[PDB]
């Protein structure tokens, strides 16, 4: 239940994604778990809220992350790659321009199992999750944030 970044594993074992524990709620991307229950040690985490269009899901309670990219500053992807220690990658986001407004986007192309890794502002707040994006052969991830 400890705050932090977590690997999402399936059973040999394979890492299928990453998520964020904050305020007793686990946050990841819908496409990582498809809403399945998660084991945590001897405990079980059940899905609480989810949305395919946002590609987000929370477990044990409602979505808690609400910080947003400021549109100007560099950010850090706290990547948790399969088989490797958690590692920070700093970058200046580009922008997804959509008919409903602009979304920050990071032009970083890491293994699928890093999907759900958090993107952070300079204060250490999670401004969204990595792993839903587009190809321009280089992948670009939206900074996907939910609503609190």
């Amino acid at each position: 239940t400890t705050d932090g970044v977590y690997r999402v594993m399936t059973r040999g074992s394979t890492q299928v994604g990453v998520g964020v524990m904050q305020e007793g709620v686990f946050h990841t991307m819908w496409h990582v778990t498809k809403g399945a229950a998660l084991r945590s040690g001897e405990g079980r985490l059940d899905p609480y809220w989810g949305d395919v269009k946002q590609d987000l899901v929370s477990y044990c309670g409602p979505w808690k992350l609400d910080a947003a990219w400021d549109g100007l500053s560099e950010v850090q992807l706290l990547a948790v790659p399969p088989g490797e220690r958690a590692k920070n990658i700093q970058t200046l986001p580009g922008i997804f321009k959509t008919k409903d407004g602009d979304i920050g986007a990071v032009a970083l192309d890491y293994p699928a199992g890093t999907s759900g890794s958090p993107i952070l502002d300079k204060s250490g707040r999670v401004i969204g999750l990595y792993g839903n994006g587009v190809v321009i052969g280089s992948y670009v991830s939206a900074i996907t944030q939910g609503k609190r």
Binding site: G4, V52, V80, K87, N88, G94, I95, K99
Partner: protein
Amino acid sequence: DMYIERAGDITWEKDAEVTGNSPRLDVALDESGDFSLVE
């Protein structure tokens, strides 16, 4: 069996590697959560 394992604290790191460019892209988001390029 889908399960989770703690991998670290959520912190900014002063000495992080820095990389990646900052493209400006027109995109659309469909009902399935898929982004696509728009011209």
